[PDB]
Design a binder for this molecule. Structure first.
Ligand SMILES: Cc1cc(NNc2ccc(C(=O)Nc3ccccc3N)cc2)c(N)cc1O
Length: 125
């Protein structure tokens, strides 16, 4: 189809390891963004067929979304917090580079990113 397989969310051979930063990323950062009124366009992978988004996957090489991030955190997929932070950054970058400035989707992304950056500024050491 026009859509790729969704990003992997589990690593069956990675040992389980918790960090307080990963706990914060799930229980504070992801939870806060997930419950925000503007979360809905970002809660699942972009479906370029259903959304009629021409060339989305020609332009966006590394799709990412908060449903994938949520599952990765729940499944202890990330070895470290910085991998998770990178996924959030990629999600926002994809939106800003594909869509036109001032499209509603971009303004929603910016509100979520502002909240994200606020919480990251309090990331535990
Ligand atoms: C990251 C990113 C996302 C998107 N849109 N994502 C969407 C758009 C719409 C919906 C929706 O459910 N609408 C909806 C709202 C109310 C009643 C029923 C329905 N169906 C879900 C996701 C675009 N375009 C560009 C983009 O870069």
């Amino acid at each position: 189809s026009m859509n790729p397989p969704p990003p992997e969310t589990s690593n069956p051979n990675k040992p389980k390891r918790q960090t307080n930063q990963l706990q914060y990323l799930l229980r504070v950062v992801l939870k806060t963004l997930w419950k925000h009124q503007f979360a809905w366009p970002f809660q699942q992978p972009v479906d370029a067929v259903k959304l009629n988004l021409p060339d989305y996957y020609k332009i966006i090489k590394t799709p990412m979304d908060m449903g994938t991030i949520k599952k990765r955190l729940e499944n202890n997929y990330y070895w470290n917090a910085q991998e998770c932070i990178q996924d959030f950054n990629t999600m926002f970058t994809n939106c800003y580079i594909y869509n036109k400035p001032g499209d509603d989707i971009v303004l929603m992304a910016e509100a979520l990113e502002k909240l994200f950056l606020q919480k990251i500024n309090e990331l535990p050491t």
